[PDB]
Scaffold this motif. Sequence first.
Motif, short mmCIF file in Angstrom:
data_model
loop_
_atom_site.label_atom_id
_atom_site.label_comp_id
_atom_site.label_asym_id
_atom_site.label_seq_id
_atom_site.Cartn_x
_atom_site.Cartn_y
_atom_site.Cartn_z
N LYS A 167 0.83 -1.20 0.00
CA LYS A 167 0.00 0.00 0.00
C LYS A 167 0.86 1.26 0.00
O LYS A 167 0.44 2.31 -0.49
N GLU A 168 2.07 1.14 0.56
CA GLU A 168 2.99 2.27 0.58
C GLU A 168 3.54 2.57 -0.81
O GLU A 168 3.75 3.73 -1.17
N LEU A 169 3.77 1.52 -1.61
CA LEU A 169 4.20 1.71 -2.99
C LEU A 169 3.10 2.35 -3.83
O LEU A 169 3.38 3.15 -4.72
N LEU A 170 1.84 2.00 -3.55
CA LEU A 170 0.72 2.65 -4.23
C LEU A 170 0.61 4.12 -3.86
O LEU A 170 0.31 4.95 -4.73
N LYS A 171 0.84 4.47 -2.59
CA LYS A 171 0.83 5.87 -2.18
C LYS A 171 1.99 6.64 -2.79
O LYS A 171 1.84 7.81 -3.17
N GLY A 172 3.16 6.00 -2.91
CA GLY A 172 4.27 6.63 -3.60
C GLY A 172 4.01 6.81 -5.09
O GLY A 172 4.42 7.82 -5.68
N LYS A 173 3.31 5.86 -5.71
CA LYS A 173 2.90 5.99 -7.10
C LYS A 173 1.91 7.14 -7.28
O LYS A 173 1.99 7.90 -8.25
N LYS A 174 0.97 7.29 -6.33
CA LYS A 174 0.02 8.41 -6.37
C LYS A 174 0.73 9.74 -6.19
O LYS A 174 0.39 10.73 -6.85
N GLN A 175 1.73 9.79 -5.30
CA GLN A 175 2.49 11.02 -5.10
C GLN A 175 3.32 11.37 -6.34
O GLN A 175 3.39 12.54 -6.73
N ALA A 176 3.93 10.37 -6.97
CA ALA A 176 4.64 10.60 -8.22
C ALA A 176 3.69 11.04 -9.33
O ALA A 176 4.06 11.88 -10.17
N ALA A 177 2.47 10.51 -9.33
CA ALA A 177 1.46 10.91 -10.31
C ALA A 177 1.05 12.37 -10.13
O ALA A 177 0.92 13.11 -11.11
N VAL A 178 0.86 12.80 -8.88
CA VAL A 178 0.43 14.19 -8.68
C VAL A 178 1.59 15.16 -8.90
O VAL A 178 1.38 16.29 -9.36
N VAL A 179 2.84 14.73 -8.65
CA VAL A 179 3.99 15.57 -9.00
C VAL A 179 4.14 15.67 -10.52
O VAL A 179 4.44 16.75 -11.05
#
Length: 33
Positions: free
Chosen positions: A1-13
């Motif tokens: 789930k942490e990798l998914l949150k990091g993917k979401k953060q990279a997506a919004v950046v």
Amino acid sequence: KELLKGKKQAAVVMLDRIFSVLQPWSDINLQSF
């Protein structure tokens, strides 16, 4: 789930980056968008 949150953060950046690409208004800028 942490990798998914990091993917979401990279997506919004990346979304903020392409919004910065569209900050100057030109045809080349929207084509690069």
